[PDB]
Amino acid sequence: GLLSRLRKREPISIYDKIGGHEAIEVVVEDFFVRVLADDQLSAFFSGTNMSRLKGKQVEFFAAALGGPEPYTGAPMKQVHQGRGITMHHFSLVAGHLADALTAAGVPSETITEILGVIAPLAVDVTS
Amino acid sequence: GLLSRLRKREPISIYDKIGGHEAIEVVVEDFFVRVLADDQLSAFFSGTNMSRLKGKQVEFFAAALGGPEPYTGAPMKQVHQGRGITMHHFSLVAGHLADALTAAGVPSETITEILGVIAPLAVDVT
């Protein structure tokens, strides 16, 4: 945990400073309420099992932001390839993530930092 | 609350100035009485959950005015998109908010300050 990490003089991860697994879970839940309420986005998920997806997204974001738990989902490029997702869609999704982070009280500077980790993933996500 | 924030040497926000979350609740109720009575505005709210909207409006205004809690609703552009809202409509709503603030006894100068925060939002709403 964070205490062990600090005892080892390891820098505080984004994961730890935003509140770890519980924070990520809450953010991902809200993120998906936002995404599924967005008529430009909801249809992408029509044939999707949301229950499982939220789980994999928690694992993915946690791992991306410095958490210890494994990602147990499929590779980004394979999952998203062929879904007709454009940079327009990717950007809307990123906007919803930023909104969920803001709603959870994460400082704007940290939101920007998180967008810096996530934005390069568009190369694997978009059509 | 305001007491703890002053102990931290935070400058007084507009939110804290006008009476905080409880003052904003009261203003928002009166605001919508005015809005829904306005024939030029009321049809936009046909079918709207007023209780929910009012709560999100309290959150929004409280946050914009420097309050302690984040806004948790949808952003202004998304929510108002495709409704054909014009500068005329926005101006009417801003007018009703100012009148509600006036009725609540907020000093004219502070209402002017609040309108300075609200008026730029028209780019997203319209």
Ligand code: HEM
């Ligand atoms: C913001 C960056 C994104 C990340 C980190 C991400 C991550 C993920 C992850 C972890 C999964 C689960 C993979 C699995 O099932 O093993 C997934 C699936 C999925 N993603 Fe994303 N994604 C992103 C952007 C997007 C965008 C922009 C769209 C469409 C607008 C999208 C649409 C989908 C859909 C529809 C699935 C589920 C496919 C199915 O039905 O199983 N994703 N994504």
Ligand code: HEM
């Ligand atoms: C003073 C600027 C305004 C602000 C701060 C504002 C704020 C908001 C907020 C916070 C919501 C709720 C968002 C959510 O559900 O997450 C909302 C929705 C809405 N607004 Fe505004 N608004 C403004 C101007 C206007 C104007 C000028 C109109 C039309 C005359 C309008 C009509 C509506 C309607 C119809 C909804 C949707 C209610 C529903 O979901 O059924 N707003 N607005």
Ligand SMILES: [C-]#N
């Ligand atoms: C993808 N969520």
Ligand SMILES: [C-]#N
């Ligand atoms: C919007 N009221």
Ligand code: NA
């Ligand atoms: Na695919």
